[PDB]
Amino acid sequence: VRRLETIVEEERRVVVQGYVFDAEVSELKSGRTLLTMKITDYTNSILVKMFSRDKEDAELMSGVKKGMWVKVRGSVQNDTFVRDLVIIANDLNEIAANERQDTAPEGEKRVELHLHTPMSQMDAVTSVTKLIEQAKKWGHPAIAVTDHAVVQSFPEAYSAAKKHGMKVIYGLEANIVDDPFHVTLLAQNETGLKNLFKLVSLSHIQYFHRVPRIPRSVLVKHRDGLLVGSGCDKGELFDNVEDIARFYDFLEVHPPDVYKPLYVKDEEMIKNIIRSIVALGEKLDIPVVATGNVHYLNPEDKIYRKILIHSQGGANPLNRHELPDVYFRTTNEMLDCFSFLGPEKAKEIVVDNTQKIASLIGDVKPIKDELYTPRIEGADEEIREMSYRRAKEIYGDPLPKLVEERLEKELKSIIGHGFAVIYLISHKLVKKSLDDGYLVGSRGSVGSSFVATMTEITEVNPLPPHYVCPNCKHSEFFNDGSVGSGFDLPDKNCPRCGTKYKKDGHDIPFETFLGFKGDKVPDIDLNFSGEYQPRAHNYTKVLFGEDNVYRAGTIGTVADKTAYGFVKAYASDHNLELRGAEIDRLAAGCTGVKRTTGQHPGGIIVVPDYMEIYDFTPIQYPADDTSSEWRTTHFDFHSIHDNLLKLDILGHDDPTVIRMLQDLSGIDPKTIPTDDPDVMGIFSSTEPLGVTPEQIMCNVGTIGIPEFGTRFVRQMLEETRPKTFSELVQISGLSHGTDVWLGNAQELIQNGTCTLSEVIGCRDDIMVYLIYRGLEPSLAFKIMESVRKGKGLTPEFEAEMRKHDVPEWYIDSCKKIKYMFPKAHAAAYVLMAVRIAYFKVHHPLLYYASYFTVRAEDFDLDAMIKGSAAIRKRIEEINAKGIQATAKEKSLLTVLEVALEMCERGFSFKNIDLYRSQATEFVIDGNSLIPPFNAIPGLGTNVAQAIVRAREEGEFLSKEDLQQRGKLSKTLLEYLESRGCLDSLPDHNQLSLF
DNA sequence: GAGACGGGCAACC
DNA sequence: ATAACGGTTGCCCGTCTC
Ligand SMILES: Nc1nc2c(ncn2[C@H]2C[C@H](O)[C@@H](COP(=O)(O)OP(=O)(O)OP(=O)(O)O)O2)c(=O)[nH]1
Ligand SMILES: [Mg+2]
Ligand SMILES: [Mg+2]
Ligand SMILES: [Mg+2]
Ligand SMILES: [Zn+2]
């Protein structure tokens, strides 16, 4: 039985063992099945191939899964397609993982009091969930979590404590400075837990130096509910009398091996230092505990950490020397390590005292169960009058029954579950943005709420389709279900006052937002312009008070691309030539480790005034930047999703684009029609653009249109040809999410199994259909919510579906969908698409200026200026690279597509112009666009803005004058000069005056 | 060596 | 061409310049 590190060349025959971390099965022309696995015994890894000789072995092959251990016998061959040695297996047997066993007797087990998770930035490697499982299996009565300076593993630890029935001790390894050394904090109770949250907050904010730290006095202030430990070799006492020590409730000592970095003479000195501490805890009646300082599960997991640390260069200084063995140690093996102090002391400090400390810890719940909802005087009642007054002024007094009932039902739910405040705050945020000159785009599931329509938090009106007279208030509603959206109606006059009817209503059920029980916590989503987002953000400090809102924080972890990067460099720097399969496994062992912190892209977390942020999470600065305008949550929004309401104040280009489209045409985009035949025609043809498909390398007219302009969506449009608002809404829905169209709805339509309109194209339809079919609404809602998060179906859901005659293809279709819009989102985004489309057709140059000004960031200006044929040449170059195209080539391709179409429509791009070019805005001149300075590679907004500033306060008098005052590098100056831009100026002036 | 700038990446809606 | 979810903010780090 050969270890995988010993497999180095072709070889007739070997037997080998290992963990299967990947397995795929495929079918050969011959009939035969091939099994392709990767295995690692943790000394190395290898790719294994097996070719079935019969259908029995073929199906067994299908049963080999990740997580299995396997003994394989076979030959070692160079495989030239994989460019690596590989095992061709004749024989395969599943085996036991037979991992480290804990042999002490039940009741007499160890507790680990000092342990690091992947949240110990770039320092630890095994998820807290796996450590917690291991402790449970080894029968440890508890296990502690004590990451460095942070408590970010708490939420996962909790979950795993619950799933596994393990008692977790919530802690912190902290940096204490005297008023810089490590201590261990263990929370005994909720007072202790809250003090932990305060300590991490203070250490990250008031007391952050170059690293989070806690003055000893501030620790004492916040010591209640915490047992304090001395600990490490970076401990206070280990680095040396009794005074220091009497400060601690427990005294830490690590296995002798752990201190092997040696500051010391030999192993006999360390053994004795440990023995001083043993004398010293006994003399002072302080429990001495054998803790492990865990940084990974098993001895061999060491390698992953070694790789992470190595990625930090001489900036780390732990690369100065070999890393200590700090794996999770069994209780019997912890005794072995401490055998020298004899059988009684071994046993005392490894199990009795370790166990005793655990007994001093209660049952702490680090994350709460319920939602805490804000109160602001007048809010419930103001939302009521706002919505009734506004509905009356549109639908009349008294209200039609339909409207009356939607209001009464909606308002008692919003109010009762405590959402009236955020509706109102959302109203003021939108109103201020408008007053400040920035329109706001609608988003997400609040469009499902007519009260939200009435409070001007969404432009989506969810009532059934209908006409309403803007003058006399008369209405007609259609509940036939025959009409998809009011926007689909034919123009019609009020048969009472004569006037032109308004059309509206997308038939969206309120429950998509709050559900039936009101036991779901949605947010409110708003698309503000990216320019304005920060100001919307700051307005929430004014509304709620500076200390009752916090920007949601994020944790930056190592994902695949970074892991593979780290592993290769480590391989390279060490002159290792590794097999693909071994690079993969080292890669996989690095993922999940925290590397940074950051900012949610827009969520503001609201704290009720009768609670405090520390009831929920610590706070800090994103990336630890002490000049940040905003503090962040220490936990990410996902951990506290159900505890506090969130305002998703997002940034987006759509609102900015149509704002500039309006500031340029004078056209009020609210007046744009949603059934203009030429505008709607671009969703299925190039006709309305006045160019050929061959001219613009595209069969539909949606180039540049948000969402619909993509290569995938264009193709869907080619084959679905929508003409109607609700048809566009249907395809918005099926174009967003994996396994929604491809392999699913597409096959269903091409099969004849259902029609385009019957395919599942928003989450709402699932619910609405299941109710129709006879399921209990709240269950239909549950099922909708499960599938739109790509969680598929439970046996109970399927059985409820079947028993009400839901067909097998619909159920199977639910199981595919990985993600899915709510209708109100699709309708919001489509409405914006159509507004912009209107300009694409009727005011083309305005459309292009706004496109290149607001959205584009990657240009080939020389190509663009030469024009049509040159642009096409570049696009073909990028097309040729296929999916081997870099993210950046794709961004360029996207913009060149719209430039080529611009050119074919008869327009063009002029060179940079010293006196007519602007800073960041593409400006209109006749039938052209004069590109702005920031379009130049290397020339950013700043220089762009300076160049414009300087010329406004005095023309340029030489190329030198332009360089000095325009703040231009030599390279940028050459860029202009070589394209003829500076030809009218002398190189320098022979005169200068003040 | 301080600081724009852009690429590459991760988190999130 | 293939297959294909689209679009946004934010953080780190190597490069190029002065
Ligand atoms: N294309 C795409 N859009 C998304 C995705 N996730 C969210 N969005 C868009 C569509 C959603 O309606 C909105 C997401 O906002 P939320 O995360 O607040 O969810 P939503 O409002 O749909 O449900 P909620 O009631 O808030 O739980 O933004 C996604 O994975 N892909
Ligand atoms: Mg330490
Ligand atoms: Mg430690
Ligand atoms: Mg939402
Ligand atoms: Zn009328």
DSSP conformation letters of A454-499:
HTTS-S---SPSEEE-TTT--EEE--SS--S-GGGSPP-B-TTT-P
What residue numbers of A does the annotated binding site for dGTP cover? 443, 445, 520, 523, 763, 788
State phi, psi for A722 to the nearest 5 degrees: -70, 150
Under 8 Å CB-to-CB from A342, ≥6 apart: which residues?
A: none
CA distance A709 to A855: 13
Q: Is the dihedral of CA A869, A872, A874, A877 positive or negative?
A: negative
**How many helices and strands, by DSSP H and E, does chain A display?**
37, 25
Cis, peptide link before residue A398, omega less than 30° from 0 = yes
Q: What CA–CA distance (Å, rounded) separates A238 from A521?
A: 50
Ligand number nearest to the C-alpha of A641 = 1
Nearest of A419, A407, A340 to residue A379 by alpha carbon = A419
Round to whole Å and give the CA distance between A922 and A861: 12
Name the 3-class secondary structure at A912. coil
Describe the crossing of helices A808-816 and A795-803 by its angle, rounded to 10 degrees: 150
CA of A819, closest atom in ligand 1: 30
For residues A423 and A873, give the distance between their C-alpha atoms in angstroms, rounded to a whole number.
Answer: 51
Separation of CA A524 and ligand 4 centre (Å): 5
In three-state secondary structure terms, A651 is strand
What is the C-alpha to C-alpha distance for residues A541 and A438, in angstroms, rounded to an integer? 20
DSSP letters along A126-144, please?
S-HHHHHHHHHHTT-S-EE
- Could you give the angle at which helices A887-904 and A868-880 cross, rounded to 10 degrees? 150
Distance in Å, CA A790 to ligand 4 centroid: 16
Q: Which of residues 561-620 of A touch strand C (CB under 7 A)?
A: 596, 598-599, 601-602
CA of residue A150 to ligand 3 center, whole Å: 12
* DSSP output for A872-885: HHHHHHHHHTGGG-
User: Could you tell me the distance, in angstroms and rounded to a whole number, from the CA of residue A470 to the centre of ligand 5?
Assistant: 7
Q: How far apart are CA A298 and CA A43, in angstroms?
A: 12
Q: Which residues pair with A504 in a beta bridge?
A: A466
CB A561 within 8 A of CB A681: no
CA dihedral A682, A684, A690, A695 (to 10 degrees): 120
User: Contact, A97 vs A39, CB < 8 A?
Assistant: no
Asked if residue A462 lies in contact with residue A508, where contact means CB atoms within 8 angstroms, the answer is yes
Tokens of A339: 């055998």
Output the residue whose Cα is nearest ligand 1's atom 2: A736
Q: Which protein residue has the closest C-alpha to ligand 1 atom 1? A: A736
d(CA A631, CA A706): 33
Beta bridge partners of A76: A11, A87
Among residues A213, A219, A218, the alpha carbon closest in space to that of A248 is found at A219
Task: Give the closest residue (by CA) to ligand 1 atom 24.
Answer: A522
Which residues are CB-contacts of A615 (< 8 A; sequence separation ≥ 6)? A194, A368, A372
Binding residues of A for Zn(2+): 123, 148, 295, 469, 472, 494, 497
Is nucleic acid strand C under 7 Å from A712's C-beta? Answer: yes
- What is the rounded CA–CA span in Å between residue A842 and residue A681? 13
A520 CA → ligand 1 middle, Å? 15
Whole-number Å distance between alpha carbons of A385 and A398: 14
Place of tokens 């520390």: A614
Q: Name the one residue in this structure whose structure tokens are 């080529």.
A: A900
A543 neighbors A666 (Cβ within 8 angstroms): no
Nearest alpha carbon to residue A182 among A208, A224, A148: A148
The residues, ordered by sequence, that sit 6+ positions from A325 with a Cβ below 8 Å of its Cβ are A257, A258, A260, A299, A302
Give A984's contacts (C-beta < 8 A, 6+ positions apart).
Answer: A914
Residue A316 CB neighbours (<10 A): 14
Q: CA A285 → CA A14, A92, A183, A654, A865, distances in Å? A: 58, 58, 19, 69, 84
Full DSSP string of A802-858: HHTT--HHHHHHHHH-S----HHHHHHHHHHHHHHHHHHHHSHHHHHHHIIIII---
CA distances from A703 to A561, A912, A964, A973 (A): 31, 25, 41, 34
Query: Which of A419, A417, A420 is CA-nearest to residue A386?
Result: A420
Distance between CA atoms of residues A165 and A918, nearest Å: 65
- A821 Cβ inside 6 Å of ligand 1: yes
CA pair distance A409, A466, nearest whole angstrom: 20
Tell me, rounded to whole angstroms, the distance of Cα A173 from its chain centroid. Answer: 28
Q: How far apart are CA A422 and CA A427, in angstroms?
A: 8
Residue matched to tokens 């506090």: A644
Is the distance from the beta carbon of residue A515 to the nearest atom of ligand 1 less than 6 Å?
Answer: no
Q: In the 8-state DSSP scheme, what is residue A250? A: B
Question: SS3 of A723, please?
Answer: coil
Q: Which residues touch strand B (CB under 7 A)?
A: A 444, 525, 552, 554-563, 565, 598, 600-603, 636-638, 646, 648, 650, 858, 886-888, 937-944
Decide: residue A171, CB within 10 A, 0-12 exposed, 13-18 middle, 19+ buried.
buried
Residues preceding chain discontinuities in chain A with C to N over 2.5 Å: 179, 240, 262
Phi and psi, residue A758, nearest 5°: -90, -5
Q: Which of A759, A738, A765, A737 is nearest to A747 (CA)?
A: A759
Which residue out of A419, A443, A741 has the highest number of ligand 1 atoms within 8 Å of its CB and is therefore the one to mutate?
Answer: A443
The H or E element that residue A676 is part of is none
How far is A48 from A51, CA to CA, in rounded Å?
A: 10
Q: Is the dihedral of CA A275, A279, A282, A287 positive or negative?
A: negative
Domains and CATH numbers, chain A: 1-96 (2.40.50.140), 110-360 (3.20.20.140), 379-529 (no CATH), 530-551+600-652 (3.30.1900.20), 552-599 (6.10.50.10), 653-735+822-843 (1.10.150.700), 736-821 (6.10.140.1510), 844-980 (1.10.150.870)
| A211 alpha carbon – ligand 2 mean position (Å) | 14
Sequential DSSP letters for A367-404: S-SS-B----TTHHHHHHHHHHHHHHHHH-SSPPHHHH
Intra-chain end-to-end CA distance of chain A, in Å: 88
Q: In the structure encoding, which two tokens stand for residue A164, read together?
A: 């596994």
Q: How far apart are the C-alpha atoms of A522 and A414, rounded to whole Å? A: 11
Can you tell me the distance from the alpha carbon of A643 to that of A370, in angstroms, rounded to the nearest whole number?
Answer: 6
User: Which residues make Cβ contacts (< 8 Å) with residue A176, sequence separation at least 6?
Assistant: A182, A183, A213, A214, A215, A216, A219, A236
**Shortest CA distance to A615 belongs to which of A305, A273, A198, A295?**
A198
**What angle separates helix A808-816 from helix A777-788, to the nearest 10 degrees?**
50
Spatial CB neighbours of A285, under 8 Å, sequence gap ≥ 6: none
Closest residue by Cα to residue A129 from A158, A99, A97:
A158
Q: Are A736 and A823 in contact (CB under 8 A)?
A: no
Q: What is the C-alpha separation between A334 and A355, in angstroms, rounded?
A: 14
Phi-psi map region of A462: left, alpha, beta (phi>0 left; psi -120 to 50 alpha)? alpha
Task: List Cβ neighbours of A101 (8 Å cut-off, separation of 6 or more).
Answer: A138, A330
Report which secondary-structure segment, H or E, holds A64: none
**Cα-flanking dihedrals φ and ψ of residue A94, to 5°?**
-65, 140
Q: Would you report the helix, strand and coil content of chain A in percent, each value rounded to 5? A: 45, 15, 40
Residue A935 Cα distances to A223, A237, A556, angstroms? 57, 60, 31
What contacts 24+ positions apart, CB below 8 Å, involve A19-22? Answer: A19/A67, A19/A68, A19/A69, A19/A97, A20/A64, A20/A65, A20/A66, A20/A67, A20/A68, A20/A69, A20/A70, A21/A45, A21/A66, A21/A584, A21/A585, A21/A588, A22/A66, A22/A584
Dig out the tokens for A942 from the structure: 């700043």
Q: A725, A487 in Cβ contact below 8 A?
A: yes
Whose C1' is closest to the CA of A884: which nucleotide?
C2
How far is Cα A218 from Cα A177, in angstroms, rounded to an integer? 10
Answer for the pair A825, A447: CB distance below 8 angstroms, yes or no.
yes
Interatomic distance A428 CA / B13 C1' (Å): 22
Report the candidate in A230, A272, A262 with the shortest Cα–Cα distance to residue A248: A230
Paired strand residues for A476:
A467
> Can you give the three-state secondary structure of A263-280, one letter per residue?
CCCCHHHHHHHHHHHHHH
Encoded tokens for A256: 């002798």
User: Ligand 1 pocket, A648 CB below 6 A?
Assistant: yes
Structure token digits, residue A42: 């943790």
* Ligand 1 pocket: which of A526, A736, A788 to mutate (most atoms within 8 A of CB): A736
Query: How many CB atoms are closer than 10 A to CB A298?
Result: 14
Answer whether A465's CB lies under 8 Å from A484's CB: yes
Closest nucleotide C1' to the C-alpha of A819: C5
Annotated binding-site residues of A read 114, 116, 123, 148, 173, 182, 232, 293, 295, 443, 445, 469, 472, 494, 497, 520, 523, 525, 763, 788
- The experimental method, as deposited, was X-ray
Query: Could you please report the per-residue DSSP string of A423-466?
Result: HHHHHHHHHHHHHTT---EE-GGGGG-HHHHHTTS-S---SPSE
Residue at A824: amino acid letter: A
Residue A149 is encoded by which pair of tokens? Answer: 């300076």
What tokens appear for A784 in the block? 């909708």
Angle between helices A725-734 and A823-842 (to 10 degrees): 120
Cα A700 to the center of its chain, rounded Å: 32
- Of residues A546, A390, A569, the one with CA closest to residue A473: A390
How far, in whole angstroms, is CA A873 from its chain's centroid? 37
Torsion of CA A455, A457, A462, A466, to 10 degrees: 60
Which residue has the CA at smallest separation from atom 26 of ligand 1?
A522
Asked if A200 and A553 count as a contact pair (C-beta separation under 8 A), the reply is no
Buried b (16+ CB within 10 A) or exposed e, A961-977: bbbebbebeeebbebbe
Q: If we measure between CA atoms, which residue out of A507, A488, A393 comes closest to residue A450?
A: A507
Residues belonging to chain A: 994
How far apart CA A626 and CA A186 sit, in angstroms, is 28
